[PDB]
Design a binder for this molecule. Structure first.
Ligand SMILES: CNC(=O)c1cc(NC)ccn1
Length: 158
């Protein structure tokens, strides 16, 4: 079903996360963590205090796909366990709960445009680009269901 998913996404905010490599998305999926540049860290912390759910939608650059999406479960914090990101300077660490670890090809989202990025297709956007509520909700609902996920515990964090 999609009903608990819709509940988690009701009045959520959505952000496009672009990773230079698959390894960082894999660490994020394994450890439930993300870290970004301070300009985006400040935006995510503001959004986390302002919305019932803040959703990060991940895309590896040059992959032509999204690799899943996740909900912020905390603001960023420093001094936790170190994360061996593959880098080419990162802020704190956000804890995240994954909502879907399955891929979605950009060919499947070509009908969705993001008003906050000049109504360009939602796949287009810099790291940290906010996706407007309706576009972001329909993008998340496009993903194949991830039957390994139970949103019951995520609902309890809202
Ligand atoms: C896990 N976080 C990253 O890989 C990242 C890298 C970056 N510049 C290379 C900017 C924001 N985030």
């Amino acid at each position: 079903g999609t009903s608990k998913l819709k509940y988690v996404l009701q009045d959520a905010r959505f952000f496009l996360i672009k990773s230079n490599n698959h390894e960082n998305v894999s660490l994020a999926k394994a450890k439930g963590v993300w870290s970004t540049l301070p300009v985006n860290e400040k935006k995510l912390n503001l959004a986390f205090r302002s919305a019932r759910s803040v959703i990060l939608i991940f895309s590896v650059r040059e992959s032509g796909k999204f690799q899943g999406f996740a909900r912020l479960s905390s603001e960023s914090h420093h001094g936790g366990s170190p994360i061996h990101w593959v880098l080419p300077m990162l802020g704190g660490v956000f804890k995240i709960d994954w909502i879907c670890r399955r891929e979605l090809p950009f060919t499947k989202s070509a009908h969705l445009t993001n008003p906050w990025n000049e109504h360009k297709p939602v796949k287009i956007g810099r790291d940290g680009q906010e996706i407007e509520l309706e576009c972001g909700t329909q993008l998340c609902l496009l993903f194949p269901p991830d039957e390994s996920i139970d949103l019951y515990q995520v609902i309890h964090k809202m």
